[PDB]
Design a protein around this ligand. Structure first.
Ligand code: PRL
Ligand code: PRL
Ligand code: PRL
Ligand code: ZN
Length: 308
């Protein structure tokens, strides 16, 4: 049969005698590009993916992936063909990835997602992610790449990745309320719902954000932003990478990034019965940790401030 999602099969195949070179639009047996080949006896009955190019396919594809972008399922299949060949060790019970093709950012992403409460909207993500959590994460990875519109081998940012991915989860009952106090301009409160309710960029410390954090006011001058209320299952605090101390028990996990713009390397840190650094397939444990951190994730429930 022919498919776009592998749940819905259309045996509009030529199963017993084709032999015009895969005149089915682009085709893909098990994620290998087979567009330009005539069929090999032992094919009849296996399932080939094809690009959604009639009204009926474009629907099922949209319902499954939650985009209609045509190049999507191409870029997906492209990436799958590589990520199928990466290895996915469990480390301390989490699915990670053996380094290949600058995949460090994807490893870190993957590791964080297994540690954070999300529900993805597109069935494809929900599906893929279950498999990932279970150890076989080639699809999940291929999808993530297609969704962020990056190709295997191209360098990636973990914050940018999560950001895209959160576009596709159910965060709508997530709420953040901020107050900005200016000496001359007085106060100014702000409510954020959805993705922007869970992400801050400028400080790593959640404590510091509750205590208050100096920012330039819109008049130019000296103000304090603080978190008045938070309702979400986690928060993600980010900044440009800087030497930072992670203390046990006080965050859930974090991504560090050492290197520079052209060459660098992400590792994942997670606070358990000790601090575990997971660096693709590698694992080390220490009681201290200081290092160039870029993103920290905290478990949240509901928080309200007590600042008068
Ligand atoms: N992995 C990396 C590496 C360098 C980075 C430099 C940055 C500078 C400004 C900003 N707002 C975010 C950044 N994030 C980075 C993330
Ligand atoms: N893997 C990498 C390497 C360099 C990077 C440099 C950055 C500069 C600004 C920004 N906002 C994000 C960045 N992310 C990076 C991610
Ligand atoms: N300071 C640095 C700079 C670049 C780096 C590039 C890497 C690539 C793969 C890998 N497994 C580890 C790396 N560590 C780096 C450490
Ligand atoms: Zn002001």
């Amino acid at each position: 049969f022919t498919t776009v999602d592998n749940i819905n099969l259309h045996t509009q195949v030529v199963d017993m005698s084709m032999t015009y070179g895969q005149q089915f639009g682009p085709t893909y047996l098990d994620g290998a590009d087979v567009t330009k080949i005539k069929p090999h006896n032992s094919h009849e009955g296996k399932t080939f993916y094809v690009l959604p190019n009639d009204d009926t396919l474009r629907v099922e594809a949209f319902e499954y992936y939650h985009t209609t972008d045509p190049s999507f399922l191409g870029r997906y299949m492209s990436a799958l063909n590589h990520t199928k060949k990466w290895k996915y060790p469990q480390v301390n019970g989490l699915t990670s990835i053996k380094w290949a093709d600058n995949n460090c950012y994807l490893a870190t992403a993957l590791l964080t997602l297994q540690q954070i409460e999300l529900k993805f909207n597109p069935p494809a993500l929900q599906d893929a992610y279950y498999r990932a959590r279970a150890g076989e994460a080639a699809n999940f990875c291929a999808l993530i790449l297609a969704y962020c519109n990056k190709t295997v081998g191209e360098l990636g940012d973990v914050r940018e990745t999560m950001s895209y991915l959160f576009q596709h989860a159910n965060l709508d009952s997530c709420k953040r309320v901020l107050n900005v106090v200016c000496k001359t301009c007085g106060q100014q409160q702000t409510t954020l719902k959805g993705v922007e309710a869970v992400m801050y960029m400028g400080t790593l410390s959640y404590e510091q954000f509750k205590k208050g954090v100096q920012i330039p006011c819109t008049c130019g001058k000296q103000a304090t932003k603080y978190l008045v209320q938070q309702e979400s299952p986690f928060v993600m605090m980010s900044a440009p990478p800087a030497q930072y101390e992670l203390k046990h028990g006080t965050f859930t996990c974090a991504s560090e990034y050492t290197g520079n713009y052209q060459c660098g390397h992400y590792k994942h840190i997670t606070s358990k019965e000790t601090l575990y650094c997971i660096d693709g397939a590698l694992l080390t444990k220490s009681s201290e940790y200081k290092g160039p951190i870029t993103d920290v994730f905290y478990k949240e429930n509901s928080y309200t401030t007590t600042i008068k």
